[PDB]
Coordinates of N, CA and C and ligand atoms in Angstrom, one line a residue:
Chain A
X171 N -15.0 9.8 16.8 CA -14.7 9.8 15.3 C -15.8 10.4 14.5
X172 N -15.8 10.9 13.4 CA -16.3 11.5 12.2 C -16.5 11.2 11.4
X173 N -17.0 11.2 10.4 CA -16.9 11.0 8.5 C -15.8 11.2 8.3
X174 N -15.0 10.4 7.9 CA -13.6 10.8 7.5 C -12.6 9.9 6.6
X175 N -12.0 10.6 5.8 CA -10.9 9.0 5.0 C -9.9 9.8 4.8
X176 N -9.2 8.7 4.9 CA -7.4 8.3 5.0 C -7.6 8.5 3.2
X177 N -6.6 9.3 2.3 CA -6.3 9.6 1.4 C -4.9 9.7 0.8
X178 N -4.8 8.8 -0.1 CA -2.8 8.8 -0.5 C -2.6 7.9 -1.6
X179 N -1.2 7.3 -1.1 CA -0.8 6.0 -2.4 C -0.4 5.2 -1.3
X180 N -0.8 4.0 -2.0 CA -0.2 2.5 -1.2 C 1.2 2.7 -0.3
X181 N 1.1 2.2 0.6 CA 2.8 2.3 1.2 C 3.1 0.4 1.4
X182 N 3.2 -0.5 0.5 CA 3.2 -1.9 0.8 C 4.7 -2.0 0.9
X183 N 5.0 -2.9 2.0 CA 5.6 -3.6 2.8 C 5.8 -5.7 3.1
X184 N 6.9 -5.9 2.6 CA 6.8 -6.9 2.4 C 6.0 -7.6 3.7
X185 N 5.5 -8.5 3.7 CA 4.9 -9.6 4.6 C 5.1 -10.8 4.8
X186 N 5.5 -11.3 6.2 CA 5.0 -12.8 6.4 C 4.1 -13.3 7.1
X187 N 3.0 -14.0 6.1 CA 1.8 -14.0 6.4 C 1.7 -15.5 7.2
X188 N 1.0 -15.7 8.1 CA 1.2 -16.9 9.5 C 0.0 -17.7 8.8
X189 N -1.4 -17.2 8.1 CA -1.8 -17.8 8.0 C -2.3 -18.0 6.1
X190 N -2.9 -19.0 5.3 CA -3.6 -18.8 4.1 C -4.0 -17.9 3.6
X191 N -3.5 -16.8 2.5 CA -4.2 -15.6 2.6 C -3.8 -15.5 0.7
X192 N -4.7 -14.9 0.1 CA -5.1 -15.0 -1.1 C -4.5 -13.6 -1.3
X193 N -4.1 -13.5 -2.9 CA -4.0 -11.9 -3.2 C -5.1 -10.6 -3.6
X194 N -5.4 -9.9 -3.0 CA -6.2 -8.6 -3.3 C -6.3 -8.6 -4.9
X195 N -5.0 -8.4 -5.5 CA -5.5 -8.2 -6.8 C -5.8 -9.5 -8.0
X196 N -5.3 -10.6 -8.0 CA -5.6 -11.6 -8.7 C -6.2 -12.5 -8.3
X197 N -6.6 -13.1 -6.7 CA -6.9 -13.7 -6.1 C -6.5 -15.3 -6.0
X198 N -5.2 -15.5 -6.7 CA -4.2 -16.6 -6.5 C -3.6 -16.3 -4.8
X199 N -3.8 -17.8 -4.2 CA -3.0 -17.5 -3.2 C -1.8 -17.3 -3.2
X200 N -1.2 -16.6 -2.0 CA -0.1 -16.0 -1.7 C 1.2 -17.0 -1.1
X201 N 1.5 -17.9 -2.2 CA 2.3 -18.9 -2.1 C 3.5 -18.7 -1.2
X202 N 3.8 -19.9 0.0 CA 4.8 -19.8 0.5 C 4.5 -19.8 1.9
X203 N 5.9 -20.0 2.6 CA 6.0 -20.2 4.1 C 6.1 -18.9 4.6
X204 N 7.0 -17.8 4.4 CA 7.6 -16.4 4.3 C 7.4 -15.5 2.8
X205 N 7.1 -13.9 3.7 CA 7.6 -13.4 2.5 C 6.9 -13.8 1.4
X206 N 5.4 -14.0 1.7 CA 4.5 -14.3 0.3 C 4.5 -13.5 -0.9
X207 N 4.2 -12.1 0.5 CA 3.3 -10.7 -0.7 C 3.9 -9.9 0.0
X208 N 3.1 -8.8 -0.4 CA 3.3 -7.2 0.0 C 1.8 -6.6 0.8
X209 N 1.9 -6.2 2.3 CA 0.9 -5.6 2.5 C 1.2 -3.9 2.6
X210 N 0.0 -3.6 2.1 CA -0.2 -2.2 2.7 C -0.2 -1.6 4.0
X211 N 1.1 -1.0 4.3 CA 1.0 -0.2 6.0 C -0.3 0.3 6.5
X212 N -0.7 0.8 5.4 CA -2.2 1.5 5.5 C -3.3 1.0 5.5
X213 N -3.7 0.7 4.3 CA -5.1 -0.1 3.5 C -5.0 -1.6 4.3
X214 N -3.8 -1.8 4.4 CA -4.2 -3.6 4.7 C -4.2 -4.4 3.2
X215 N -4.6 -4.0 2.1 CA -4.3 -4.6 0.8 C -3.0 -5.4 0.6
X216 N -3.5 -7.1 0.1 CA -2.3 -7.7 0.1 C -2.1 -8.3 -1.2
X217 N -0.9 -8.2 -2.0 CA -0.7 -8.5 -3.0 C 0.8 -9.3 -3.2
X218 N 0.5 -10.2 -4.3 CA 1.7 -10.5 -5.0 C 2.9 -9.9 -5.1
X219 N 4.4 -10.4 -5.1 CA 4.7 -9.5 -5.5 C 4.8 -8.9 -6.9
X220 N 4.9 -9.8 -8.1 CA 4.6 -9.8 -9.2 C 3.2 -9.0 -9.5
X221 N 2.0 -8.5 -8.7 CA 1.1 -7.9 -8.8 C 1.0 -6.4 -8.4
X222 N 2.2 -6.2 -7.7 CA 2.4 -4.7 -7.4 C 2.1 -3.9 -8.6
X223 N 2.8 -3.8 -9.8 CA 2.5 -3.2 -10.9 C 1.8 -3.0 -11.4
X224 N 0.2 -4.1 -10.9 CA -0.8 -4.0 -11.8 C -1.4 -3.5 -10.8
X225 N -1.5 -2.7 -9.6 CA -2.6 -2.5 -8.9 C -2.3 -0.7 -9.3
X226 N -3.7 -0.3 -9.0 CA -3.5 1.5 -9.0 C -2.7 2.1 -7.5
X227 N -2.0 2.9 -7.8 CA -1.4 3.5 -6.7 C -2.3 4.0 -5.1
X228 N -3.9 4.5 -6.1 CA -4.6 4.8 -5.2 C -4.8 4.1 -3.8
X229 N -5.0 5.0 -2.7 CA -4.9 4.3 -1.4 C -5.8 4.9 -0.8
X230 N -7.4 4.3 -0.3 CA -8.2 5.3 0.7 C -9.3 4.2 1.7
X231 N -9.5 4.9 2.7 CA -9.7 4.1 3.7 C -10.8 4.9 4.5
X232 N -11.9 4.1 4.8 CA -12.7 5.0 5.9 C -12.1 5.4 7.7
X233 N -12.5 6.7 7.9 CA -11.2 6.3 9.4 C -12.4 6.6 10.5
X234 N -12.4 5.6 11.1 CA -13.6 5.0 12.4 C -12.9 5.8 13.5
X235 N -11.6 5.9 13.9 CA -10.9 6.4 15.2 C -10.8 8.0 15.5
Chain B
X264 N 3.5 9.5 -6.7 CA 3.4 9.4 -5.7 C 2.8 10.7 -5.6
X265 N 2.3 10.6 -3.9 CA 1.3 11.7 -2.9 C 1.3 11.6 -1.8
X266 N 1.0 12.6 -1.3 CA 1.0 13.0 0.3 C -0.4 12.0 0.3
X267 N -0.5 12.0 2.1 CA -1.9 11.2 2.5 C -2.4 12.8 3.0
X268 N -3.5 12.7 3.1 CA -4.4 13.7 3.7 C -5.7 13.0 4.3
X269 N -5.9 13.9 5.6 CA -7.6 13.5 5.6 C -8.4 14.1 5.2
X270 N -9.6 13.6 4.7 CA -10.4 14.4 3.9 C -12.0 14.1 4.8
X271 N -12.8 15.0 4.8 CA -14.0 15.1 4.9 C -15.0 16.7 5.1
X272 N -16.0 16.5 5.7 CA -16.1 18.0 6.1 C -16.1 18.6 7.3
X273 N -15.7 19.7 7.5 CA -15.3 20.6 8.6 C -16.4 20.1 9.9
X274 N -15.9 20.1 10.7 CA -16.4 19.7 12.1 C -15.9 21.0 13.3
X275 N -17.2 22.2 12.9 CA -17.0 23.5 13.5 C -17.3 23.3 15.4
X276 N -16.5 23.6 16.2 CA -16.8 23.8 17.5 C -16.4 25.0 18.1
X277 N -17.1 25.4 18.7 CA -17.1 27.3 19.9 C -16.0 27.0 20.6
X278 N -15.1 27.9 20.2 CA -13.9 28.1 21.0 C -13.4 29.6 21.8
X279 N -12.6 29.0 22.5 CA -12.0 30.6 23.7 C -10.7 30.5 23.0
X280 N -10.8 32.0 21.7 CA -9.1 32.2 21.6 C -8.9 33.3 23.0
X281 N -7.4 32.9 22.6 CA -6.8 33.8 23.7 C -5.9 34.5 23.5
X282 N -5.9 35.4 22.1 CA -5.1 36.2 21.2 C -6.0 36.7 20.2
X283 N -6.1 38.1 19.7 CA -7.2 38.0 18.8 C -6.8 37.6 17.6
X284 N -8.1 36.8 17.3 CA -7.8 35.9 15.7 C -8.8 37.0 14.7
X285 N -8.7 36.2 13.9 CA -9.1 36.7 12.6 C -10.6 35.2 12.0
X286 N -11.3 35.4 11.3 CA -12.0 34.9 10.5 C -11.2 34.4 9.2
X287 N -10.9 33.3 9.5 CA -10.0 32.8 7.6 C -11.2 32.8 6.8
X288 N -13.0 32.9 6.8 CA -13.6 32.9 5.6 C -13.4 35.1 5.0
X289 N -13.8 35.4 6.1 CA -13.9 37.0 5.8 C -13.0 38.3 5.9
X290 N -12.1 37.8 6.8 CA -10.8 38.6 7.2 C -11.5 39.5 8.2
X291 N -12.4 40.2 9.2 CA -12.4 40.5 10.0 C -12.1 39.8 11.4
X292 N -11.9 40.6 12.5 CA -11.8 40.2 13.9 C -13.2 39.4 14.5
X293 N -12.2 38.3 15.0 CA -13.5 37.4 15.8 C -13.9 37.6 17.3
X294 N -14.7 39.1 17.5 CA -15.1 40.1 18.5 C -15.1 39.6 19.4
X295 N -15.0 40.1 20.6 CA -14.7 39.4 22.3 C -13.3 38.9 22.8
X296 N -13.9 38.5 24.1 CA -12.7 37.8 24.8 C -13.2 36.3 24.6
X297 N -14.4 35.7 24.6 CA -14.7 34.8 25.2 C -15.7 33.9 23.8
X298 N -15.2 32.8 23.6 CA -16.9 32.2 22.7 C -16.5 33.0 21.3
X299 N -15.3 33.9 20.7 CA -15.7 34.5 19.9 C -16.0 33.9 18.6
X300 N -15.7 32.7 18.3 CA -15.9 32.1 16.8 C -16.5 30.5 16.9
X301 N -15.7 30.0 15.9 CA -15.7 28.3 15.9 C -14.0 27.9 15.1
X302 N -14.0 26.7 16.0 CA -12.9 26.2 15.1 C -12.7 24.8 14.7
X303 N -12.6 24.3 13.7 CA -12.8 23.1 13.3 C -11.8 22.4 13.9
X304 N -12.5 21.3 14.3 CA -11.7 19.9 15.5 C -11.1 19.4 14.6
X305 N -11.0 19.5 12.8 CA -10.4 18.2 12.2 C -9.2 19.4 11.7
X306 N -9.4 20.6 10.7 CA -8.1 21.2 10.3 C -7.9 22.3 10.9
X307 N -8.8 23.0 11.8 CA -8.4 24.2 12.5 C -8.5 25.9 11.7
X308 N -9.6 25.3 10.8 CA -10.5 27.1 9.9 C -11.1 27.2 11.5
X309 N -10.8 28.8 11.3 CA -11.3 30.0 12.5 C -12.7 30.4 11.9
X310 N -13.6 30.5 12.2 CA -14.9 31.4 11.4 C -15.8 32.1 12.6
X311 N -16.2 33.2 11.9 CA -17.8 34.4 12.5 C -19.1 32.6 13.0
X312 N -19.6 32.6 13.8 CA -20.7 31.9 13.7 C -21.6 32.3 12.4
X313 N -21.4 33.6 11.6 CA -22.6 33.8 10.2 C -21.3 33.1 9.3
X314 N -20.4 33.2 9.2 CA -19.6 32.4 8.1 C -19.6 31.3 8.2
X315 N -20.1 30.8 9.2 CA -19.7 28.8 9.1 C -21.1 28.6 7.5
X316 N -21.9 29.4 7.4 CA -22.8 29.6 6.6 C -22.7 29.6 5.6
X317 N -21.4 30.3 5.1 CA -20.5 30.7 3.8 C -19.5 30.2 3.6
X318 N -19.4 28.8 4.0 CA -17.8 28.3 3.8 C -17.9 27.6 3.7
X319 N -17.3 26.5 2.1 CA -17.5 25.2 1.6 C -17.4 24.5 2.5
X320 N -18.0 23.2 2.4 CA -18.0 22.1 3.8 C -16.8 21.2 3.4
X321 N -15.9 21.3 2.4 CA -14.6 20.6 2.3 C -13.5 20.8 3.1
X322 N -13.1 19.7 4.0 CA -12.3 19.8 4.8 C -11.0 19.0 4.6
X323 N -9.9 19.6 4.8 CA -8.9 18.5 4.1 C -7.5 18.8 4.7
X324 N -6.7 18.0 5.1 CA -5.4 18.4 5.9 C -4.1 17.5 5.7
X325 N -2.9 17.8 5.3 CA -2.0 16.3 4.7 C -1.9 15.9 6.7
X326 N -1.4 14.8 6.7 CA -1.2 14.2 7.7 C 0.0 13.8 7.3
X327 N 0.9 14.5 8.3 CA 2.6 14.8 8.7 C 2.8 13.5 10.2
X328 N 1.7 13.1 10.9 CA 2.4 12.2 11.8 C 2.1 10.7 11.7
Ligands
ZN84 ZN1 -3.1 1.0 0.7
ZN85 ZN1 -1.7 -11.6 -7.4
ZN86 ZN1 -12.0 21.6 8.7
ZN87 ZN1 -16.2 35.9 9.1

């Protein structure tokens, strides 16, 4: 691997998260059994879904591989 | 929305073409059979060993897979 980053826009995907997990952008947890939030395919960023709108589209990542 | 791309800088390595290429910084032929240039392991710029000298170190490629 190299100096290098992943560069784009969010690609979030809904989630069901197994365990307690808080949101990226407001930091309320991610209420619920199923189907809390939205993660990012990419970034891993997990959000509300009510908080999708407020997050920037930007997506970037350092890439180790 | 946006394409993803990787971004960083060019990561030049000595290569054996086996067709004659060209220099993408200068437009001349990259002399010989053997060893004649470098080619970047991340986007694949062809250069003279004196052009890797003259060619911005921005390296950047959309990623299609
Ligand atoms: Zn992301
Ligand atoms: Zn939230
Ligand atoms: Zn390059
Ligand atoms: Zn050249």
């Amino acid at each position: 691997g190299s100096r290098r980053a992943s560069v784009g826009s969010h690609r979030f995907k809904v989630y069901n998260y197994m365990s307690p997990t808080f949101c990226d952008h407001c930091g309320s947890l991610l209420w619920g059994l199923v189907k809390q939030g939205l993660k990012c395919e990419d970034c891993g960023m997990n959000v509300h879904h009510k908080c999708r709108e407020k997050v920037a589209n930007l997506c970037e990542f350092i890439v180790t591989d």
